[PDB]
Protein backbone atom coordinates (compact mmCIF):
# COMPACT_ATOMS: atom_id res chain seq x y z
CA UNK A 1 0.00 0.00 0.00
CA UNK A 2 1.57 3.38 -0.71
CA UNK A 3 1.70 6.31 2.02
CA UNK A 4 0.20 9.31 2.87
CA UNK A 5 2.78 12.17 2.48
CA UNK A 6 3.18 12.74 5.82
CA UNK A 7 3.88 8.96 6.61
CA UNK A 8 7.34 9.16 4.99
CA UNK A 9 7.74 12.74 6.57
CA UNK A 10 7.30 11.78 10.23
CA UNK A 11 9.80 8.47 10.01
CA UNK A 12 12.58 10.94 8.81
CA UNK A 13 11.91 13.40 11.39
CA UNK A 14 11.36 10.09 14.02
CA UNK A 15 15.20 8.97 12.54
CA UNK A 16 16.74 12.56 13.50
CA UNK A 17 14.57 12.66 17.00
CA UNK A 18 15.88 8.71 18.09
CA UNK A 19 19.76 9.32 17.11
CA UNK A 20 19.93 12.60 18.58
CA UNK A 21 18.11 11.72 21.89
CA UNK A 22 17.92 8.33 22.05
CA UNK A 23 15.01 5.62 21.61
CA UNK A 24 13.38 5.66 25.34
CA UNK A 25 13.86 9.32 25.38
CA UNK A 26 11.86 10.05 22.15
CA UNK A 27 8.53 11.18 22.34
CA UNK A 28 5.54 11.16 20.08
CA UNK A 29 5.18 15.08 20.51
CA UNK A 30 9.14 15.57 19.94
CA UNK A 31 8.81 13.68 16.54
CA UNK A 32 5.56 15.73 15.89
CA UNK A 33 7.39 18.91 16.31
CA UNK A 34 10.26 17.62 13.99
CA UNK A 35 8.32 16.46 11.32
CA UNK A 36 6.40 20.04 11.76
CA UNK A 37 2.82 18.44 12.73
CA UNK A 38 0.04 18.99 15.24
CA UNK A 39 0.64 15.67 17.64
CA UNK A 40 -2.89 14.18 16.92
CA UNK A 41 -1.20 14.46 13.15
CA UNK A 42 1.10 11.07 14.35
CA UNK A 43 -1.59 9.22 15.66
CA UNK A 44 -3.41 9.41 12.25
CA UNK A 45 -0.41 7.43 10.62
CA UNK A 46 1.00 5.48 13.95
CA UNK A 47 -0.41 4.49 17.41
CA UNK A 48 2.93 4.89 18.93
CA UNK A 49 6.66 5.21 19.18
CA UNK A 50 7.69 1.58 19.24
CA UNK A 51 5.21 1.77 15.96
CA UNK A 52 7.36 4.41 14.23
CA UNK A 53 10.12 2.54 15.34
CA UNK A 54 9.26 -0.81 13.32
CA UNK A 55 7.76 0.75 10.52
CA UNK A 56 11.22 2.83 9.87
CA UNK A 57 13.00 -0.17 10.30
CA UNK A 58 10.50 -1.75 7.28
CA UNK A 59 10.72 1.41 5.42
CA UNK A 60 14.31 2.02 5.48
CA UNK A 61 14.91 -1.35 4.81
CA UNK A 62 12.87 -2.28 1.94
CA UNK A 63 14.92 0.54 0.03
CA UNK A 64 17.66 -1.12 1.20
CA UNK A 65 17.53 -4.17 -0.20
CA UNK A 66 15.79 -3.66 -3.43
CA UNK A 67 18.72 -0.61 -4.60
CA UNK A 68 21.16 -3.97 -3.49
CA UNK A 69 19.64 -6.51 -5.20
CA UNK A 70 19.59 -3.64 -8.24
CA UNK A 71 22.74 -2.96 -8.52
CA UNK A 72 23.73 -6.58 -8.25
CA UNK A 73 21.20 -8.00 -11.31
CA UNK A 74 23.40 -5.43 -13.27
CA UNK A 75 26.49 -7.45 -12.78
CA UNK A 76 28.31 -10.82 -13.92
CA UNK A 77 30.68 -12.06 -11.81
CA UNK A 78 28.91 -13.40 -8.10
CA UNK A 79 31.83 -12.10 -6.65
CA UNK A 80 31.36 -8.49 -7.94
CA UNK A 81 28.07 -9.32 -6.85
CA UNK A 82 29.17 -9.86 -3.32
CA UNK A 83 31.65 -7.04 -3.79
CA UNK A 84 28.24 -4.86 -4.28
CA UNK A 85 26.49 -6.41 -1.37
CA UNK A 86 29.40 -5.45 0.23
CA UNK A 87 29.51 -1.75 -1.18
CA UNK A 88 26.26 -1.16 -1.45
CA UNK A 89 25.30 -1.80 2.68
CA UNK A 90 28.43 0.29 3.66
CA UNK A 91 27.50 3.30 1.50
CA UNK A 92 23.79 3.48 2.39
CA UNK A 93 24.82 3.84 5.91
CA UNK A 94 27.87 6.39 5.48
CA UNK A 95 25.30 8.44 3.77
CA UNK A 96 22.76 8.77 6.51
CA UNK A 97 24.55 8.21 9.96
CA UNK A 98 21.31 9.39 11.93
CA UNK A 99 20.00 6.43 10.54
CA UNK A 100 22.68 4.53 11.29
CA UNK A 101 22.56 5.33 14.93
CA UNK A 102 19.17 3.93 14.83
CA UNK A 103 19.71 0.80 13.09
CA UNK A 104 22.67 -0.04 15.28
CA UNK A 105 22.96 1.33 18.58
CA UNK A 106 18.88 2.33 19.12
CA UNK A 107 17.92 -0.60 17.92
CA UNK A 108 11.25 -8.59 24.10
CA UNK A 109 8.49 -8.87 21.17
CA UNK A 110 10.09 -5.15 19.66
CA UNK A 111 13.88 -7.80 18.99
CA UNK A 112 11.21 -10.53 17.27
CA UNK A 113 9.65 -8.15 15.00
CA UNK A 114 13.52 -6.11 14.00
CA UNK A 115 14.58 -9.97 13.46
CA UNK A 116 11.79 -10.58 10.82
CA UNK A 117 12.12 -7.39 8.88
CA UNK A 118 15.82 -8.43 8.93
CA UNK A 119 14.74 -11.63 6.60
CA UNK A 120 14.03 -9.49 3.73
CA UNK A 121 18.09 -8.99 3.70
CA UNK A 122 19.20 -12.23 4.97
CA UNK A 123 16.88 -14.04 2.18
CA UNK A 124 18.93 -11.81 -0.40
CA UNK A 125 21.93 -13.09 0.82
CA UNK A 126 20.58 -16.43 0.42
CA UNK A 127 19.97 -15.87 -3.16
CA UNK A 128 23.13 -14.96 -3.75
CA UNK A 129 25.49 -17.96 -2.11
CA UNK A 130 22.72 -20.45 -3.86
CA UNK A 131 24.04 -18.72 -6.95
CA UNK A 132 27.73 -18.53 -6.24
CA UNK A 133 27.37 -22.17 -5.15
CA UNK A 134 25.18 -23.46 -8.37
CA UNK A 135 27.99 -21.67 -10.41
CA UNK A 136 31.05 -22.60 -8.64
CA UNK A 137 32.05 -19.45 -6.87
CA UNK A 138 31.93 -21.04 -3.31
CA UNK A 139 32.72 -23.80 -2.40
CA UNK A 140 30.21 -26.47 -2.96
CA UNK A 141 29.52 -27.72 0.71
CA UNK A 142 29.02 -24.69 2.13
CA UNK A 143 26.44 -24.41 4.53
CA UNK A 144 24.06 -21.39 3.50
CA UNK A 145 22.98 -20.81 6.69
CA UNK A 146 26.08 -20.13 8.05
CA UNK A 147 27.66 -18.67 5.68
CA UNK A 148 24.85 -15.60 5.47
CA UNK A 149 25.42 -15.28 9.17
CA UNK A 150 29.38 -14.57 8.59
CA UNK A 151 28.51 -12.46 6.11
CA UNK A 152 25.80 -10.57 7.87
CA UNK A 153 27.23 -10.83 11.28
CA UNK A 154 30.70 -9.36 10.13
CA UNK A 155 29.12 -6.32 8.31
CA UNK A 156 26.65 -5.12 11.10
CA UNK A 157 29.88 -6.14 13.78
CA UNK A 158 32.14 -3.66 11.39
CA UNK A 159 29.11 -0.52 11.26
CA UNK A 160 28.56 -1.02 14.59
CA UNK A 161 31.60 -0.40 15.74
CA UNK A 162 31.80 2.77 13.60
CA UNK A 163 28.99 4.05 14.76
CA UNK A 164 30.44 3.25 17.90
CA UNK A 165 33.50 5.80 16.78
CA UNK A 166 30.60 8.56 16.23
CA UNK A 167 30.92 7.75 12.62
CA UNK A 168 34.23 9.83 12.28
CA UNK A 169 36.29 7.26 9.61
CA UNK A 170 35.61 6.40 6.40
CA UNK A 171 33.50 3.27 6.62
CA UNK A 172 33.66 2.84 2.41
CA UNK A 173 37.20 2.29 3.12
CA UNK A 174 36.57 -1.13 4.37
CA UNK A 175 34.59 -2.40 1.40
CA UNK A 176 37.52 -4.28 -0.30
CA UNK A 177 39.19 -5.35 2.16
CA UNK A 178 35.68 -6.89 4.48
CA UNK A 179 34.76 -8.49 0.93
CA UNK A 180 38.20 -10.06 0.83
CA UNK A 181 38.23 -11.41 3.90
CA UNK A 182 34.88 -13.02 3.33
CA UNK A 183 35.78 -15.02 0.75
CA UNK A 184 39.09 -16.14 1.65
CA UNK A 185 39.08 -16.54 5.37
CA UNK A 186 41.96 -15.52 7.78
CA UNK A 187 43.86 -18.28 5.65
CA UNK A 188 43.80 -16.55 2.25
CA UNK A 189 44.61 -13.37 -0.19
CA UNK B 1 28.18 -15.52 49.36
CA UNK B 2 29.67 -13.64 46.12
CA UNK B 3 29.17 -16.66 42.96
CA UNK B 4 25.20 -17.11 44.52
CA UNK B 5 24.70 -13.58 44.06
CA UNK B 6 26.58 -13.68 40.47
CA UNK B 7 24.34 -16.57 39.81
CA UNK B 8 21.59 -15.37 41.13
CA UNK B 9 22.02 -12.19 39.08
CA UNK B 10 21.85 -14.43 35.94
CA UNK B 11 18.20 -16.45 36.57
CA UNK B 12 17.35 -13.14 37.95
CA UNK B 13 17.94 -10.98 34.90
CA UNK B 14 17.30 -13.74 31.89
CA UNK B 15 13.87 -14.34 33.41
CA UNK B 16 12.91 -11.08 34.17
CA UNK B 17 15.00 -9.21 31.74
CA UNK B 18 17.45 -6.58 32.97
CA UNK B 19 14.46 -3.47 33.26
CA UNK B 20 12.09 -5.32 35.35
CA UNK B 21 14.93 -6.79 36.89
CA UNK B 22 15.00 -5.43 40.84
CA UNK B 23 18.03 -5.98 42.78
CA UNK B 24 16.05 -6.98 45.97
CA UNK B 25 14.54 -9.84 43.43
CA UNK B 26 18.45 -10.96 42.79
CA UNK B 27 18.96 -10.70 46.70
CA UNK B 28 15.80 -13.14 47.24
CA UNK B 29 16.82 -15.61 44.33
CA UNK B 30 20.78 -15.93 46.07
CA UNK B 31 19.21 -16.31 49.71
CA UNK B 32 20.80 -13.34 50.99
CA UNK B 33 19.47 -10.00 52.85
CA UNK B 34 18.85 -6.83 50.32
CA UNK B 35 21.22 -5.34 52.60
CA UNK B 36 24.16 -7.49 51.53
CA UNK B 37 23.77 -7.62 48.06
CA UNK B 38 25.55 -3.93 48.79
CA UNK B 39 28.52 -4.74 50.30
CA UNK B 40 29.88 -5.85 46.65
CA UNK B 41 27.46 -3.83 44.60
CA UNK B 42 26.78 -0.13 44.64
CA UNK B 43 23.55 -0.34 42.28
CA UNK B 44 21.80 -2.05 39.78
CA UNK B 45 24.36 -1.47 36.91
CA UNK B 46 27.38 -2.63 39.12
CA UNK B 47 25.89 -5.83 39.43
CA UNK B 48 25.50 -6.30 35.61
CA UNK B 49 28.83 -5.06 35.02
CA UNK B 50 30.42 -7.21 37.95
CA UNK B 51 28.66 -10.27 36.13
CA UNK B 52 29.59 -9.66 33.13
CA UNK B 53 33.09 -8.92 33.97
CA UNK B 54 33.31 -12.24 36.08
CA UNK B 55 32.15 -14.67 33.67
CA UNK B 56 33.95 -13.06 30.80
CA UNK B 57 37.09 -13.15 33.33
CA UNK B 58 36.50 -16.57 33.87
CA UNK B 59 35.99 -17.62 30.48
CA UNK B 60 38.84 -15.57 29.05
CA UNK B 61 41.28 -16.82 31.50
CA UNK B 62 40.18 -21.02 30.65
CA UNK B 63 41.00 -20.06 26.60
CA UNK B 64 44.22 -18.96 27.56
CA UNK B 65 45.37 -22.03 29.60
CA UNK B 66 43.35 -24.01 27.08
CA UNK B 67 45.35 -22.19 24.35
CA UNK B 68 48.84 -22.08 25.93
CA UNK B 69 48.77 -26.25 25.90
CA UNK B 70 48.01 -26.33 22.47
CA UNK B 71 50.53 -26.68 19.61
CA UNK B 72 49.06 -25.25 16.71
CA UNK B 73 47.59 -21.67 16.11
CA UNK B 74 44.19 -23.16 14.44
CA UNK B 75 43.88 -25.67 16.96
CA UNK B 76 44.07 -22.12 18.86
CA UNK B 77 41.65 -20.80 16.98
CA UNK B 78 39.52 -24.17 17.79
CA UNK B 79 39.80 -24.19 20.91
CA UNK B 80 38.40 -20.57 21.73
CA UNK B 81 35.06 -21.29 19.41
CA UNK B 82 34.54 -24.68 21.25
CA UNK B 83 34.87 -22.53 24.64
CA UNK B 84 32.56 -20.07 23.31
CA UNK B 85 29.83 -22.55 22.33
CA UNK B 86 30.18 -24.90 24.85
CA UNK B 87 29.61 -22.31 28.12
CA UNK B 88 26.46 -20.87 26.72
CA UNK B 89 25.33 -24.07 25.38
CA UNK B 90 26.15 -25.23 29.16
CA UNK B 91 23.99 -22.28 30.34
CA UNK B 92 21.23 -21.36 28.32
CA UNK B 93 19.87 -18.46 31.01
CA UNK B 94 23.33 -16.83 30.36
CA UNK B 95 22.84 -17.02 26.72
CA UNK B 96 20.09 -15.10 26.91
CA UNK B 97 21.59 -12.57 29.27
CA UNK B 98 25.10 -12.11 26.50
CA UNK B 99 22.85 -12.54 23.61
CA UNK B 100 19.78 -9.93 24.53
CA UNK B 101 20.24 -8.16 27.99
CA UNK B 102 23.44 -6.92 27.49
CA UNK B 103 22.51 -5.74 24.38
CA UNK B 104 21.75 -1.87 25.60
CA UNK B 105 20.62 1.18 24.11
CA UNK B 106 21.56 3.53 27.11
CA UNK B 107 25.09 4.99 25.60
CA UNK B 108 27.34 5.31 29.43
CA UNK B 109 26.35 1.35 30.09
CA UNK B 110 26.87 0.18 26.67
CA UNK B 111 30.06 1.52 27.34
CA UNK B 112 31.03 0.08 30.12
CA UNK B 113 29.93 -3.68 28.74
CA UNK B 114 32.40 -2.59 25.85
CA UNK B 115 35.14 -2.59 28.11
CA UNK B 116 34.87 -5.81 29.37
CA UNK B 117 34.19 -7.32 25.91
CA UNK B 118 37.74 -5.93 25.15
CA UNK B 119 39.52 -8.47 27.31
CA UNK B 120 37.86 -11.46 24.85
CA UNK B 121 38.64 -8.73 21.64
CA UNK B 122 42.11 -8.47 22.71
CA UNK B 123 42.74 -12.31 23.27
CA UNK B 124 41.38 -12.63 19.26
CA UNK B 125 43.47 -9.32 18.34
CA UNK B 126 46.80 -11.79 20.19
CA UNK B 127 46.00 -15.02 17.96
CA UNK B 128 45.62 -12.78 15.19
CA UNK B 129 48.77 -11.74 15.27
CA UNK B 130 50.70 -14.66 16.85
CA UNK B 131 49.06 -16.47 13.37
CA UNK B 132 50.54 -13.92 11.27
CA UNK B 133 53.91 -13.60 12.38
CA UNK B 134 53.97 -17.73 12.49
CA UNK B 135 52.80 -17.82 9.02
CA UNK B 136 49.05 -19.38 9.29
CA UNK B 137 47.57 -16.22 8.31
CA UNK B 138 48.61 -14.04 5.54
CA UNK B 139 50.77 -11.19 6.08
CA UNK B 140 48.62 -8.37 5.34
CA UNK B 141 45.68 -9.61 7.11
CA UNK B 142 43.52 -6.68 8.77
CA UNK B 143 43.95 -7.67 12.35
CA UNK B 144 40.81 -5.47 13.65
CA UNK B 145 38.58 -6.39 10.23
CA UNK B 146 39.31 -9.97 11.58
CA UNK B 147 39.03 -9.65 15.00
CA UNK B 148 35.27 -8.16 13.71
CA UNK B 149 34.20 -11.29 11.68
CA UNK B 150 35.67 -13.60 14.01
CA UNK B 151 33.58 -12.07 17.03
CA UNK B 152 31.02 -10.96 14.83
CA UNK B 153 29.92 -14.16 12.89
CA UNK B 154 30.50 -16.26 16.63
CA UNK B 155 27.90 -13.76 18.16
CA UNK B 156 25.28 -14.26 15.44
CA UNK B 157 25.17 -17.26 15.33
CA UNK B 158 24.66 -17.89 18.92
CA UNK B 159 21.86 -14.77 19.21
CA UNK B 160 20.51 -17.25 16.35
CA UNK B 161 20.28 -20.20 18.49
CA UNK B 162 19.05 -18.14 21.15
CA UNK B 163 16.40 -16.75 19.52
CA UNK B 164 15.27 -20.19 17.77
CA UNK B 165 15.06 -21.29 22.12
CA UNK B 166 18.18 -23.06 21.94
CA UNK B 167 16.41 -26.21 19.97
CA UNK B 168 19.39 -27.62 17.91
CA UNK B 169 22.83 -28.17 19.30
CA UNK B 170 25.24 -24.93 19.46
CA UNK B 171 28.30 -27.31 20.33
CA UNK B 172 27.72 -29.32 17.11
CA UNK B 173 28.64 -26.03 14.87
CA UNK B 174 31.88 -25.55 16.45
CA UNK B 175 33.89 -26.94 13.39
CA UNK B 176 31.97 -25.85 10.46
CA UNK B 177 32.40 -22.41 11.72
CA UNK B 178 35.85 -22.91 12.56
CA UNK B 179 36.28 -23.80 8.69
CA UNK B 180 34.24 -21.10 7.20
CA UNK B 181 36.80 -18.37 9.47
CA UNK B 182 39.50 -20.14 8.31
CA UNK B 183 39.04 -20.58 4.36
CA UNK B 184 36.15 -17.86 3.80
CA UNK B 185 33.28 -18.52 1.28
CA UNK B 186 35.82 -19.29 -1.87
MG1 LIG C 1 26.85 -8.50 15.61
Not at 113 to 118: A, M, P, Q, R
Request: glycine residues 6%; contains cysteine.
Amino acid sequence: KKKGPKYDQIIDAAVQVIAEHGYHQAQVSKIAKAAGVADGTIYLYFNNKEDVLISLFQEKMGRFVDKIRSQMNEATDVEEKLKILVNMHFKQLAADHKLAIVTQLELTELALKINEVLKGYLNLLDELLMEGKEKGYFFQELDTRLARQMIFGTLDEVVTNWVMKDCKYDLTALVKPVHQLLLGGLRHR
